[PDB]
């Protein structure tokens, strides 16, 4: 299907790395349902957050997942051979950190390695969960000094969700990533990638470890920390669509997610160009396919423009010069798009006189 199909859009698959009883070791297993997960891996039979994360991901709505087990009693390099993965998580890192067996430096090194791996593949964005029992000032200090990450492929989620554990019948604190990733998938099934996955409900969440007020959010939001807050009559909702990047142009999660999705779809659709002649015919075919793919995105309103020309532009003609990048057997295509920024703040002004 890779030699005749045109460029088409991409399902969202989350790769989970952690500890779980039974199952394979360091082997990425594709799981489509919770029943498949308990048939292959183990249920809640240990002090591991992987089962909770997978349960939250599937309960919130998830098409598929790639579960990876590295040390499950009773690893990112293996995820480089999979293309459909669009997000990753390490739920059991904080589980090991809580016991004191793993210090904070090792956790920071692991998170840096995960961010670097995400930057390499170029098609996925990582989700970061902070250590538990932290305040607004504590998390600000942790994010700005001890863990000062700066990357366009990372999103941090501060407060920990408290979900239900059938093993003990009580409420346990787990990182929100396993749930948060699921929310992302719901967006891709209900509103598309072009819409920031902010105003969504954490279905599996019962309570939060600490309620965040607007005063603390006023300092948490600008430093790229996305919060989870409970609103009366609305439930538990995510608040924030920012990445852990210092670049103002890449400070919104939706823009980066849409760019990654478009790049991955184009790369998947252009897999037949290998061993094809580097002449004007191939360039014309590439331009036609990219235009036919992008016009559908323009019609859906993801891009801004009165006409397709002002919303997207494709240049693959004569850009690949004969002596540079053509003698190297490469074809270069340039694409420009115009996304739409979200409305973070809504301001109302009431006047007595009328």
């Amino acid at each position: 299907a890779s030699g005749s199909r045109p460029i088409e859009g991409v399902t969202s698959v989350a790769a989970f790395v952690g500890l779980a009883p039974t199952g394979p070791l360091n082997e990425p297993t594709l799981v489509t349902n919770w029943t498949q997960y308990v048939a292959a891996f183990g249920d809640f039979t240990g002090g591991y957050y992987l089962a909770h994360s997978v349960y939250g991901f599937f309960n919130n709505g998830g098409s598929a997942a790639y579960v990876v087990r590295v040390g499950g009693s009773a690893g990112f390099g293996g995820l480089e051979a999979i293309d459909e993965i669009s997000m990753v998580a390490v739920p059991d890192l904080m589980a090991a950190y809580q016991r004191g067996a793993i210090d904070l430096e090792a956790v920071k090194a692991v998170q840096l390695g995960l961010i670097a791996h995400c930057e390499l593949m170029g098609d996925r964005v990582a989700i970061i969960d902070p250590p538990p029992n932290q305040n607004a000032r504590q998390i600000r200090v942790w994010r700005q000094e001890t863990a000062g990450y700066d990357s366009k492929y990372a999103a941090l989620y501060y407060p920990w969700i408290k979900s239900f554990d059938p093993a003990t019948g009580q409420s346990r604190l787990v990182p929100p990533s396993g749930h948060v990733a699921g929310i992302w998938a719901r967006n891709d099934s209900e509103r598309g990638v072009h819409k920031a996955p902010a105003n969504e409900v954490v279905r599996g969440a019962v309570d939060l470890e600490l309620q965040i007020t607007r005063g603390e959010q006023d300092l948490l939001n600008p430093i790229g920390v996305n919060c989870i807050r409970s609103f009366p009559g609305r439930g538990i909702r995510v608040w924030g669509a920012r990445t852990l990047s210092s670049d103002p142009a890449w400070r919104y999660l939706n823009i980066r997610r849409y760019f990654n999705y478009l790049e991955e779809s184009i790369l998947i659709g252009t897999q037949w160009v290998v061993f094809e002649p580097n002449d004007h015919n191939l360039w014309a075919r590439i331009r036609r396919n990219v235009s036919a793919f992008l016009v559908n995105e323009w019609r859906n309103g993801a891009l801004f423009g009165q006409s397709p020309d002002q919303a997207y532009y494709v240049k693959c003609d004569e850009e690949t010069n004969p002596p540079e990048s053509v003698d190297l057997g490469r074809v270069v295509c340039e694409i420009g798009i115009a996304p739409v920024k979200p409305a973070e703040f809504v301001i109302f002004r009431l006047a007595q006189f009328s």
Binding site: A1, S4, P6, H280, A284, R285, R288, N289, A292, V295
Partner: protein, 146 residues
């Protein structure tokens, strides 16, 4: 020279993604069309007439390419994939190129989501001298000239 100064000879070609077709004997009319919408109203106070024509939606068509009958059954396989409902692979992007001398593409018509819907075999006669001709009707939702 000038763009209008170079004429176009009937040296054409086709390219369908997934369908291995090299040459065509003839190609029907492909047009870009639009809907005109007349509306007549009298100017209200004084009574003088004022008819206006205004743009409507663009239109899909059906470009058909005819190729000599041979052993190859690319169009047969295309229509077979069409009749079974497997339109994830039946809907293809097509291109009709027309070039001047020196074999340099001059004009290109891109057919978006083109999909064949009718294959007709030429009439067979015992005393016939010409080769058998296969007619293919390829309908398209959108045609973009480039």
């Amino acid at each position: 020279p000038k763009p209008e100064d170079v004429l176009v000879a009937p040296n054409f070609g086709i390219q369908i993604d997934g369908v291995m077709v090299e040459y065509l004997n003839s190609v029907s009319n492909l047009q870009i069309e639009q809907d005109v919408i007349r509306y007549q109203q009298n100017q209200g106070t004084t009574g003088r007439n004022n008819v206006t024509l205004m743009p409507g939606v663009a239109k899909d068509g059906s470009v058909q390419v005819e190729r000599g009958m041979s052993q190859s059954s690319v169009f047969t396989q295309w229509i077979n994939d069409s009749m079974a409902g497997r339109m994830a692979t039946a809907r293809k992007n097509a291109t009709i190129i027309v070039m001047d001398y020196e074999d340099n593409p001059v004009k290109r018509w891109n057919l978006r989501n083109a999909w064949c819907s009718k294959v007709v075999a030429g009439t067979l006669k015992a005393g016939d001298t010409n080769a058998l001709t296969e007619t293919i009707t390829i309908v398209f939702e959108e045609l973009v000239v480039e």
